[PDB]
Scaffold this active site. Structure first.
Site, mmCIF file in Angstrom:
data_model
loop_
_atom_site.group_PDB
_atom_site.id
_atom_site.type_symbol
_atom_site.label_atom_id
_atom_site.label_comp_id
_atom_site.label_asym_id
_atom_site.label_seq_id
_atom_site.Cartn_x
_atom_site.Cartn_y
_atom_site.Cartn_z
ATOM 1 N N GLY A 102 5.951 -27.001 -18.707
ATOM 2 C CA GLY A 102 4.822 -27.323 -17.867
ATOM 3 C C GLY A 102 4.308 -28.729 -18.055
ATOM 4 O O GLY A 102 4.837 -29.531 -18.825
ATOM 5 N N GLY A 103 3.224 -29.036 -17.338
ATOM 6 C CA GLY A 103 2.635 -30.364 -17.454
ATOM 7 C C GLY A 103 2.188 -30.681 -18.872
ATOM 8 O O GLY A 103 2.540 -31.720 -19.436
ATOM 9 N N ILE A 104 1.389 -29.783 -19.463
ATOM 10 C CA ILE A 104 0.974 -29.950 -20.853
ATOM 11 C C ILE A 104 2.172 -29.841 -21.777
ATOM 12 O O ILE A 104 2.358 -30.675 -22.669
ATOM 13 C CB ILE A 104 -0.110 -28.925 -21.219
ATOM 14 C CG1 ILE A 104 -1.363 -29.158 -20.376
ATOM 15 C CG2 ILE A 104 -0.375 -28.959 -22.721
ATOM 16 C CD1 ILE A 104 -2.276 -27.979 -20.401
ATOM 17 N N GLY A 105 3.017 -28.831 -21.547
ATOM 18 C CA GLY A 105 4.144 -28.581 -22.435
ATOM 19 C C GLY A 105 5.095 -29.755 -22.578
ATOM 20 O O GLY A 105 5.538 -30.064 -23.689
ATOM 21 N N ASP A 151 -11.848 -31.554 -26.142
ATOM 22 C CA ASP A 151 -13.289 -31.830 -26.126
ATOM 23 C C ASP A 151 -13.637 -32.947 -27.086
ATOM 24 O O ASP A 151 -14.501 -33.788 -26.795
ATOM 25 C CB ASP A 151 -14.106 -30.604 -26.528
ATOM 26 C CG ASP A 151 -14.028 -29.473 -25.548
ATOM 27 O OD1 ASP A 151 -13.783 -29.708 -24.330
ATOM 28 O OD2 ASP A 151 -14.261 -28.334 -26.044
ATOM 29 N N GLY A 170 5.599 -22.347 -23.099
ATOM 30 C CA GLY A 170 5.088 -23.043 -21.936
ATOM 31 C C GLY A 170 5.538 -24.486 -21.861
ATOM 32 O O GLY A 170 4.887 -25.305 -21.194
ATOM 33 N N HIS A 173 -15.334 -23.520 -25.729
ATOM 34 C CA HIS A 173 -14.494 -24.510 -25.071
ATOM 35 C C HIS A 173 -14.722 -24.575 -23.564
ATOM 36 O O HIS A 173 -13.930 -25.198 -22.848
ATOM 37 C CB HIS A 173 -13.033 -24.216 -25.384
ATOM 38 C CG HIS A 173 -12.107 -25.318 -25.012
ATOM 39 N ND1 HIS A 173 -12.332 -26.627 -25.377
ATOM 40 C CD2 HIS A 173 -10.930 -25.307 -24.344
ATOM 41 C CE1 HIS A 173 -11.338 -27.377 -24.938
ATOM 42 N NE2 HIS A 173 -10.480 -26.603 -24.295
ATOM 43 N N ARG A 231 -12.132 -36.467 -25.865
ATOM 44 C CA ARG A 231 -12.982 -36.914 -24.766
ATOM 45 C C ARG A 231 -14.299 -37.478 -25.293
ATOM 46 O O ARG A 231 -14.745 -38.552 -24.873
ATOM 47 C CB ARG A 231 -13.254 -35.756 -23.807
ATOM 48 C CG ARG A 231 -12.083 -35.403 -22.913
ATOM 49 C CD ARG A 231 -12.398 -34.143 -22.160
ATOM 50 N NE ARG A 231 -11.457 -33.872 -21.078
ATOM 51 C CZ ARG A 231 -11.310 -32.694 -20.497
ATOM 52 N NH1 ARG A 231 -12.028 -31.655 -20.889
ATOM 53 N NH2 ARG A 231 -10.417 -32.552 -19.519
ATOM 54 N N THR A 267 -3.768 -22.081 -23.666
ATOM 55 C CA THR A 267 -4.035 -21.347 -22.431
ATOM 56 C C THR A 267 -5.511 -20.990 -22.280
ATOM 57 O O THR A 267 -6.115 -20.415 -23.185
ATOM 58 C CB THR A 267 -3.199 -20.065 -22.426
ATOM 59 O OG1 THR A 267 -1.843 -20.387 -22.776
ATOM 60 C CG2 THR A 267 -3.249 -19.384 -21.071
ATOM 61 N N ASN A 268 -6.083 -21.311 -21.112
ATOM 62 C CA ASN A 268 -7.497 -21.015 -20.871
ATOM 63 C C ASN A 268 -7.678 -19.669 -20.187
ATOM 64 O O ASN A 268 -6.751 -19.142 -19.582
ATOM 65 C CB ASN A 268 -8.145 -22.115 -20.032
ATOM 66 C CG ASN A 268 -8.823 -23.155 -20.866
ATOM 67 O OD1 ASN A 268 -9.395 -22.869 -21.925
ATOM 68 N ND2 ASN A 268 -8.771 -24.393 -20.393
HETATM 69 N N1 LIG Z 1 -7.298 -25.744 -23.979
HETATM 70 C C1 LIG Z 1 -7.560 -26.869 -23.093
HETATM 71 O O1 LIG Z 1 -8.380 -27.721 -23.365
HETATM 72 C C2 LIG Z 1 -6.771 -27.010 -21.766
HETATM 73 C C3 LIG Z 1 -5.882 -25.867 -21.398
HETATM 74 N N2 LIG Z 1 -5.285 -25.737 -20.075
HETATM 75 C C4 LIG Z 1 -4.549 -24.620 -19.885
HETATM 76 O O2 LIG Z 1 -3.079 -24.931 -20.122
HETATM 77 C C5 LIG Z 1 -2.425 -24.072 -19.402
HETATM 78 C C6 LIG Z 1 -1.182 -24.675 -18.756
HETATM 79 O O3 LIG Z 1 -1.571 -25.740 -17.918
HETATM 80 P P1 LIG Z 1 -0.437 -26.699 -17.296
HETATM 81 O O4 LIG Z 1 0.533 -27.199 -18.245
HETATM 82 O O5 LIG Z 1 -1.127 -27.825 -16.555
HETATM 83 O O6 LIG Z 1 0.230 -25.683 -16.198
HETATM 84 P P2 LIG Z 1 1.793 -25.697 -15.750
HETATM 85 O O7 LIG Z 1 1.769 -24.764 -14.537
HETATM 86 O O8 LIG Z 1 2.258 -27.088 -15.454
HETATM 87 O O9 LIG Z 1 2.690 -25.081 -17.003
HETATM 88 C C7 LIG Z 1 2.557 -23.729 -17.451
HETATM 89 C C8 LIG Z 1 3.849 -23.289 -17.888
HETATM 90 O O10 LIG Z 1 3.704 -21.909 -18.450
HETATM 91 C C9 LIG Z 1 4.888 -21.409 -18.214
HETATM 92 N N3 LIG Z 1 4.860 -19.965 -18.365
HETATM 93 C C10 LIG Z 1 4.293 -19.064 -17.580
HETATM 94 N N4 LIG Z 1 4.512 -17.853 -18.092
HETATM 95 C C11 LIG Z 1 5.237 -18.002 -19.212
HETATM 96 C C12 LIG Z 1 5.772 -17.117 -20.171
HETATM 97 N N5 LIG Z 1 5.591 -15.700 -20.009
HETATM 98 N N6 LIG Z 1 6.479 -17.622 -21.200
HETATM 99 C C13 LIG Z 1 6.673 -18.923 -21.335
HETATM 100 N N7 LIG Z 1 6.190 -19.790 -20.448
HETATM 101 C C14 LIG Z 1 5.464 -19.357 -19.379
HETATM 102 C C15 LIG Z 1 5.248 -21.914 -16.689
HETATM 103 O O11 LIG Z 1 6.669 -21.686 -16.336
HETATM 104 C C16 LIG Z 1 4.909 -23.169 -16.720
HETATM 105 O O12 LIG Z 1 6.054 -24.160 -17.006
HETATM 106 C C17 LIG Z 1 -3.455 -23.534 -18.242
HETATM 107 O O13 LIG Z 1 -3.645 -22.155 -18.589
HETATM 108 C C18 LIG Z 1 -4.603 -24.039 -18.448
HETATM 109 O O14 LIG Z 1 -5.510 -22.833 -18.520
HETATM 110 C C19 LIG Z 1 -5.528 -26.865 -19.097
HETATM 111 C C20 LIG Z 1 -5.974 -28.205 -19.713
HETATM 112 C C21 LIG Z 1 -6.915 -28.152 -20.863
#
Ligand SMILES: NC(=O)C1=CN([C@@H]2O[C@H](COP(=O)(O)OP(=O)(O)OC[C@H]3O[C@@H](n4cnc5c(N)ncnc54)[C@H](O)[C@@H]3O)[C@@H](O)[C@H]2O)CC=C1
Ligand SMILES: NC(=O)C1=CN([C@@H]2O[C@H](COP(=O)(O)OP(=O)(O)OC[C@H]3O[C@@H](n4cnc5c(N)ncnc54)[C@H](O)[C@@H]3O)[C@@H](O)[C@H]2O)CC=C1
Lengths: 300, 301
Positions: A10-13, A139, A7, A166, A142, A107-108
């Site tokens: 993504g934003g977190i990644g 958590d 991942g 969580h 924060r 992932t949530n």
């Molecule tokens: N545990 C926690 O405290 C938190 C977890 N969060 C979770 O973090 C996850 C991602 O959030 P964001 O980064 O903001 O979202 P984002 O949409 O910016 O990034 C998610 C990334 O996952 C990638 N992705 C999707 N499917 C696959 C796959 N099969 N293989 C590899 N990569 C894939 C996608 O391309 C994307 O770049 C969300 O599910 C939220 O549920 C959100 C923030 C807090």
């Protein structure tokens, strides 16, 4: 030492990848994997930073090259059924390629997705309950920030244990166990609700245009770097994380963990609880057990 | 010290903001401004990180609340040339009006031109201080450090390459002849110089449509911004290469090693002894660099 981020585009990644490139121990390796086509270039971008951390990025549907040899896998990929399917997909690949890695699920909903991951690893015959973690660290950081503000403390010196799950009422910050800090019951109740709902502060301020990414990157980097230190043999590394434990409260439960070379070294006692904390703990176990069962069911 | 990041919701801006939130000294303030409506929540996101750095975010067309009291302003705003040139002119006008004594670091490209735009806006506003206006070229330095360390078997964090000139293509001149402890063959110089000059293209090609460097530029801008803050606080011996208005020996604006202090540039340091290769590369790019500068002067004048 190799860390794989799944991942990573993504934003977190990308925030996590940036912090790991700059903070992993010299001599570490970092692999980024995301189905987004930009991911190899994210790694190339980061490879221009002069730290002794070798980084490569991978895309497509086969995560094998990113996972090969990984010691730690951090999964920030990602409504419920979609995220559940992503975790199942990715943990199946982890099971086949680096089954002895420590696995951190971002992932949530973590309370459920960790149970999904456990069942996938069990079906593959490689499940090590000491090596599967739900990353709850946001958590904690924060809680640290909010307590330090309220008490005029230096934020980097405040550490708040957080147990349970969580999400919502399952998040239980142990504000009674913070050294040098004491709150009234009304302050505890208000601050606990604030911690439980803190993600909404971000969503609302982003004008409905996004969620927490940068602070989660930081929290995930803290947790990941703690695993890396412990896996290298450093002693005294403690983090709260959601793990399968002795089932006293629920099958999966977040509590302070001493980490070591095989993942969890010791699941530490949650310690002495206030009246508020005891009541909140009893009061959320039914919810937590329902979240766990949802993950077990999804995999069947 | 207070640092304001303009363009803070973008790819560079968020990376930069994250690094500043976590690395600015205790007691610092950080303001984020961007016309993107997410920006106040980018700051709230970062505000949940437990460091002693107060952070607030702002949107709308008025950057005044972000800029009030700022000591350092870093500008990575962007949407092509004409619109980005207009963004720089607009934002530097707001700086000139609100925090004219701040150190200003221009990240927005093309840096060789946009710094000239900024200088002419500040001159028109009557507050131009050539010691406090910088084109942020640090990405060229940290790239050079990485590539040299890899080639020569050195620890990446122990390598520091001076890079002079401008910030695009043949105007980027790494002084490999001045790297402490390392010597290079003529062919190594040729390979490394080509790689450093084309490294931005290198990321664009690798990103396969996702665009230019973001995360490594966040790191480079944070390095530069943190150096400015340390120098403003009185720390000694803080040296950064940056694109500034100097004595004009080579061009009106030119990147050279700078000793920083409490008023911005404390000393513009000599580029030193140049190898034959470096001397040829310097002479060869001056026409290009002067044309870039004149483009920016003309945009304002
Ligand atoms: N545990 C926690 O405290 C938190 C977890 N969060 C979770 O973090 C996850 C991602 O959030 P964001 O980064 O903001 O979202 P984002 O949409 O910016 O990034 C998610 C990334 O996952 C990638 N992705 C999707 N499917 C696959 C796959 N099969 N293989 C590899 N990569 C894939 C996608 O391309 C994307 O770049 C969300 O599910 C939220 O549920 C959100 C923030 C807090
Ligand atoms: N100096 C250097 O070495 C580097 C400079 N780069 C330049 O950095 C700039 C930004 O790049 P990215 O971050 O990837 O682009 P981006 O599109 O992700 O971010 C630009 C941001 O500026 C914001 N913005 C636009 N107008 C305004 C305004 N009037 N006020 C405030 N904010 C505004 C916009 O909303 C957006 O969030 C570009 O010009 C790039 O070419 C790219 C990489 C290297």
């Amino acid at each position: 030492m190799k860390v794989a981020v799944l991942g990573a585009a993504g934003g977190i990644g990308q925030a996590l990848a940036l912090l790991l490139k700059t903070q992993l121990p010299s001599g570490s390796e970092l692999s980024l994997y995301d189905i987004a086509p930009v991911t190899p270039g994210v790694a190339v971008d980061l490879s221009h930073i002069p730290t002794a951390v070798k980084i490569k990025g991978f895309s497509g549907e086969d995560a094998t090259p990113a996972l090969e040899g990984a010691d730690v896998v951090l999964i920030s990929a990602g409504l419920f059924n979609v995220n559940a399917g992503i975790v199942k997909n990715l943990v199946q690949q982890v099971a086949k390629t680096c089954p002895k890695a420590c696995i951190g699920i971002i992932t949530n909903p973590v309370n459920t997705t960790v149970a999904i991951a456990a069942e996938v690893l069990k079906k593959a015959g490689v499940y090590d309950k000491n090596k599967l973690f739900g990353v709850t660290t946001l958590d904690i950081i924060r809680s640290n920030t909010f307590v330090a503000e309220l008490k005029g403390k230096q934020p980097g010196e405040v550490e708040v244990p957080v147990i349970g799950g969580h999400s919502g009422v399952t998040i239980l910050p142990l504000l009674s166990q913070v050294p040098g800090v004491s709150f009234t019951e009304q302050e505890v109740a208000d601050l606990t609700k604030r911690i439980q709902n803190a993600g909404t502060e971000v969503v609302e301020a982003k004008a409905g245009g996004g969620s927490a990414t940068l602070s989660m990157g930081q929290a995930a980097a803290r947790f990941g770097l703690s695993l890396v230190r412990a896996l290298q043999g450093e002693q005294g590394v403690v983090e709260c994380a959601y793990v399968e434990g002795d089932g006293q409260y629920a099958r999966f439960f977040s509590q302070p963990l001493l980490l070591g070379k095989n993942g969890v070294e010791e699941r530490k006692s949650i310690g002495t609880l206030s009246a508020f904390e005891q009541n909140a703990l009893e009061g959320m176990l039914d919810t937590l057990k329902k979240d766990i069962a949802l993950g077990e069911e999804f995999v069947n």
